[PDB]
Amino acid sequence: VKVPRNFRLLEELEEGQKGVGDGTVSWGLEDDEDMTLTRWTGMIIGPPRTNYENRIYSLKVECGPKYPEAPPSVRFVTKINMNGINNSSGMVDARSIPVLAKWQNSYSIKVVLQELRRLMMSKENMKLPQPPEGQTYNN
């Protein structure tokens, strides 16, 4: 068992539950029963005055065995029109997101969600026409 991975994920679980960091971000175990810590859920509260205003976006994060040395798998569940996000799967691209492209072991899921929300406030995304709220890439 990956001692650092398990230990780190257990710590990030706390930060996710308490929503520490920026404040407008939260995450945690999606299944909850799955203590392997390989199924994380992320929630980003859309910033007001933008096209994501009052839009609660949900994401899915999967931390591999190389975590946190290697970048985890992050994808959107709710339909969102943002640069770097696939329109069919909702999968986020690594080279498109600064923190994913230039990932560091000092990063965390917290930083990822915060960065994504930060990029949502960017001019290139804040004015992107969003599809009907409620539509998901699956189910």
């Binding site: 308490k18 407008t24 945690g28």
Partner: protein, 76 residues
Amino acid sequence: MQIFVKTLTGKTITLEVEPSDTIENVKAKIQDKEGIPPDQQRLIFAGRQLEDGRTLSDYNIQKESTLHLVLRLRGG
């Protein structure tokens, strides 16, 4: 138990409630001490949205938990 209700504004208030208490009542208590209308109160925990007609035990909320109070802008 003492819980920490932190609003997106930054302010963190302490609430003395029991797990058997409903969020609908929790909001009312916040409305009494802070003055924030329950209608525009939206609690976020464990990366998910909480309901009104549910108890703190419904989301497994314990003591010293920093809940997130997201203002639900209604009319603007």
